[PDB]
């Protein structure tokens, strides 16, 4: 029942169980969706499709309000907003929009990490001789 | 800021707080690839004998 759902800004399968159906919302993983379901007082055995619409609204609101529902501060994928200074858990459309902002900040100060991203290289200090391998030969002639 | 061989003039911005001074003075410069040499591939290292 209810094969298709619509949460936040991503389609959600109803045939899969609640935790792993909610993982498709980007910015929410296997563990984070597990805590949210437990805090929302919703049974884990039943699938996401057969949830009541009142259960859906409880699940979604607790996602954008993790701190208000006694969720530990160290699950949040941002624990210190460098612009704001507050913990925040970011949902699907926000991480992509926010990812540019972090790259924009790094680029506009001409830092090394931002420069590496702009050039299109590994930024965590990886070795890049035998393992970059983006294109093709390039033979000897 | 000294970067290996020369000093790079960098003006500190309020957005630059929380990073090392080595961020803003690159030490290796980007790599602009040229042309492969003789030993770049297996089928090219053979030197002819006449």
């Amino acid at each position: 029942f209810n094969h298709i759902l619509r949460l936040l800004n991503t389609n959600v399968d109803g045939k899969q169980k609640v935790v792993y159906s909610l993982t498709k919302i980007k910015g929410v993983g296997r563990r984070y969706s597990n805590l949210v379901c437990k805090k929302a007082d919703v049974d884990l055995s039943k699938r996401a499709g057969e949830l009541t619409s009142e259960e859906l609204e409880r699940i979604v609101t607790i996602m954008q309000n993790p701190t208000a529902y006694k969720i530990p501060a160290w699950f949040l994928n941002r624990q210190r907003d460098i612009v704001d200074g507050k913990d925040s858990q970011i949902l699907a459309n926000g991480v992509d929009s926010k990812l540019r902002d972090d790259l924009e900040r790094l680029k506009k100060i001409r830092a090394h990490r931002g420069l590496r991203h702009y050039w299109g290289l590994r930024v965590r200090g990886q070795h890049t001789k035998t393992t970059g391998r983006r294109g093709r030969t390039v033979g000897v002639s | 800021i000294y970067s290996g061989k020369e000093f790079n003039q960098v003006e500190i911005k309020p957005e630059m707080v929380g990073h090392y001074l080595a961020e803003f003075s690159i030490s290796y410069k980007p790599v602009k690839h040229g042309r492969p040499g003789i030993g770049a591939t297996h089928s090219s290292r053979f030197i002819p004998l006449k």
């Binding site: 210190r80 200074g85 507050k86 | 929380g18």
Partner: peptide, 26 residues
């Protein structure tokens, strides 16, 4: 998360609690 006016006059210990963990260790 602190305004720039007080940020430049902030004390050492108060500066510590805000900055990144690597900055704190230094």
């Amino acid at each position: 998360g602190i305004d720039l006016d007080a940020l430049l006059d902030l004390g050492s210990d108060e500066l510590r609690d805000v900055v990144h963990a690597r900055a704190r260790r230094r």
